[PDB]
């Protein structure tokens, strides 16, 4: 417990095991400084249709004529695996699986989407986002050109990512930061806050030491990163409202059971 560097290395090792596409690998792809070929670029209906079969997708069947609904369906497949990846990482945070099972669920329910939007920034530049484990690249303009309300989903995530990426965090930093987010003692409905705060205290101490060592020139980086937590909550809040426009005005679009459970009675 006393060694903060051992905690940082443990979290980083688990981070590498749980998340196939790290920021380091994503930056190597986005800057072309990698041995592998450039990603397939999806910028319109035709380029989506041409790269569609490389998008991971297992269902009953051909899903739809509409581009917006095609992306909506494929993005929710990714979100499901992201929750599964974050759950796997959460079980490696020291002390997490010793917590009440109901509190583990609660911490996941409120934490996963803040983590999803954090790690999306690793896959984004000002012009697009990497998809399918870096094999493809879907442009920001294309996502914004989708008919309402579909064109409004990704744009706030891009705006957050440009400012968040300016902090120049790396995978070692992000591994501790996402653990800090999961171990939030102020999530609604937590039964035993004190043991959760005890874990977050060490994670916060490890994060502060990690940022001072890895960014000795970035004064008050710890404070700037904690303030980004408030940006992530607006994204969640705005995203839930966008999902409700979908739920009231679009037809057949029922979310995956796991996503429905997370959003149900959320805030």
């Amino acid at each position: 417990s006393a060694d903060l560097r051992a905690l940082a290395k443990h979290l980083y090792d688990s981070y590498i095991k749980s998340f196939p596409l790290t920021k380091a690998k994503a930056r190597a792809i986005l800057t072309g400084k990698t041995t592998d070929k450039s990603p397939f670029v999806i910028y319109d209906m035709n380029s989506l249709m041409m790269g569609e079969d490389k998008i991971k997708f297992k269902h009953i069947t051909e899903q739809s004529k509409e581009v917006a609904i095609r992306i909506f369906q494929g993005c929710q497949f990714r979100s499901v695996e992201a929750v599964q990846e974050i759950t796997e990482y959460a079980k490696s945070i020291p002390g997490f699986v010793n917590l009440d099972l109901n509190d583990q669920v609660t911490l996941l329910k409120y934490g996963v989407h803040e983590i999803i939007y954090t790690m999306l920034a690793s896959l984004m530049n000002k012009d697009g986002v990497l998809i399918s484990e870096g094999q493809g690249f879907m442009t920001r303009e294309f996502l914004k050109s989708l008919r309402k309300p579909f064109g409004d989903f990704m744009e706030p995530k891009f705006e957050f990512a440009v400012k968040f990426n300016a902090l120049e965090l790396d995978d070692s930093d992000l591994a501790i930061f996402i653990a800090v987010i999961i171990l939030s003692g102020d999530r609604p409905g937590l039964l035993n806050v004190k043991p959760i705060e005890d874990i977050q205290d060490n994670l916060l101490q490890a994060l502060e030491l990690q940022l001072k060592l890895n960014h000795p020139e970035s004064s008050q980086l710890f404070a700037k990163l904690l303030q980004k937590m408030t940006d992530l909550r607006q994204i969640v809040t705005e995203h839930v409202q966008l999902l409700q426009v979908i739920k009231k005005t679009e037809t057949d679009m029922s979310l995956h059971p796991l996503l429905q459970e997370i959003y149900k009675d959320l805030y």
Partner: peptide, 10 residues
């Protein structure tokens, strides 16, 4: 439902 708890219990 208890889907989140299912991913937890491995």
């Amino acid at each position: 439902s208890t889907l989140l708890a299912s991913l937890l219990q491995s």
